[PDB]
With several copies, the nearest count.
Chain A
């Protein structure tokens, strides 16, 4: 049983730490339905590393059928 998280610390490899501290939401638990002339709101909470500046993005599998507007606020 290889534990990749621990193996990604060999000094020869010399990886860089993850730049985001937290990225969480309750949206992962359930699937959602959009009926005709209906909309929904999704929420996520993200905390970056002390010094790093990660850029969050939101994507959709089917852009022809689904449109999104995303707002990131502190």
Chain B
């Protein structure tokens, strides 16, 4: 697998994003499969740590070449602080790739 994130400051494997009240964080990833792919189902599985303080909207699209585009939109629920980690895991990918899982951390707080 190959993970493409062309947006600057989102490229680093570990990243922490801050959300204020009513603010929203949007990002997009592309997955290029160097081989066959599990086409009916998306190649990325994602989980959230304390979904009670973060609402997540995910959109995924396949294309002609089987590349997978996903957009994640992260927003806070209401006025409280805490932190949650959303992990995006290539379940199909082997243990030999340099990057399999991505662990953004979303903080509701003063940046």
By a beta-carbon cutoff of 8 Å, the part of chain A in contact with chain B is: 73-74
Contacts and interface: CB of A to CB of B under 8 A. Distances in A.
Contacts, number: 3
Secondary structure class of chain A's binding surface, majority of residues: loop
3 contacts: A73-B6, A74-B4, A74-B6
B67 to A, nearest CB: 11
Contacts of B4: 74
Interface string B18-32: 000000000000000
B64 to A, nearest CB: 16
Interface in B1-46: 4, 6
Contacts of A74: 4, 6
Contacts of B6: 73-74
Nearest to B30: A74
A52 to B, nearest CB: 14
B4 to A, nearest CB: 7
Query: 3 closest pairs, A vs B, by CB?
Result: A73-B6, A74-B4, A74-B6
Contacts of A73: 6
Nearest to B4: A74
